[PDB]
Design a protein around this ligand. Structure first.
Ligand SMILES: *CC(=O)/N=C/c1cccc(C)c1
Length: 225
């Protein structure tokens, strides 16, 4: 469990910030709203790895939701081709993601899903797929991302440098794009060391979330309501 941990009590993370007044205050407050947490490895891939695991875990046992998600995943090669990716170069990453979705369907256990996401090979193939799909979704909607995020940004250079490569950190744009690319509603809780309110953002703004993440010390951990 070196990439994604077993479930722990929320208050177990006090030990990560000993004798810290603001972090203790915010973690106590978080414990009033959430019951458990899983930690992720801080290797620069933790957003993709956390969102992929938590969303697929939320599908377990839900036969209609699995059928609809599989139908969307089967169309994602068309998003990659429209953005200029070549089939022979994405094949191994697409096949790894489709495999873990079939595991959710066929096996249906937390234990089997957690083993794939802790297998360095399978887990990194899944992360690389999710990074290629994020890049494709932004590229194919460049005018949207310029209109609503930043009129001045260079979209192709940003995807090349800050989305595709393994270990590159995320900002709001990658979070919004992968949410939209896979129709995943997620809520991010923010815990920093400023004397401010514990607060959160929902992607998309509308939505009822499937996934809750904690963003703290540049790391995304998984929360349970
Ligand atoms: C999500 C992820 O992998 N974060 C890695 C990280 C942690 C701590 C400090 C930095 C810059 C990164």
């Amino acid at each position: 469990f070196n990439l994604i941990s077993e479930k722990c009590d929320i208050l177990s993370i006090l030990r990560d910030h000993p004798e810290n007044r603001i972090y203790r205050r915010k973690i106590e407050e978080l414990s009033k709203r959430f019951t458990a947490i899983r930690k992720t490895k801080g290797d620069r891939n933790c957003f993709y790895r956390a969102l992929g695991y938590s969303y697929l875990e939320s599908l377990l046992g839900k036969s209609r939701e699995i059928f609809k998600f599989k139908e969307r995943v089967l169309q994602t090669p068309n998003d990659l081709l429209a953005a200029g990716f070549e089939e022979h170069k994405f094949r191994n990453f697409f096949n790894a993601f489709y495999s873990v979705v079939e595991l959710v369907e066929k096996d249906g256990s937390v234990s089997s899903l957690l083993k794939v996401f802790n297998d360095q090979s399978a887990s990194d193939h899944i992360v690389q797929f999710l990074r290629l799909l994020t890049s494709a979704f932004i590229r194919n909607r460049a005018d949207f991302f310029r209109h609503f995020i930043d009129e001045e940004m260079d979209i192709k250079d940003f995807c090349t440098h800050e989305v595709e490569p393994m270990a590159t950190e995320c900002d709001h744009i990658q979070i919004t794009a992968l949410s939209q690319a896979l129709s995943i509603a997620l809520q991010v809780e923010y815990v920093d060391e400023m004397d401010t309110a514990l607060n959160h953002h929902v992607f998309p703004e509308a939505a009822t979330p499937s996934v809750y993440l904690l963003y703290k010390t540049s790391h995304y951990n998984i929360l349970y309501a």
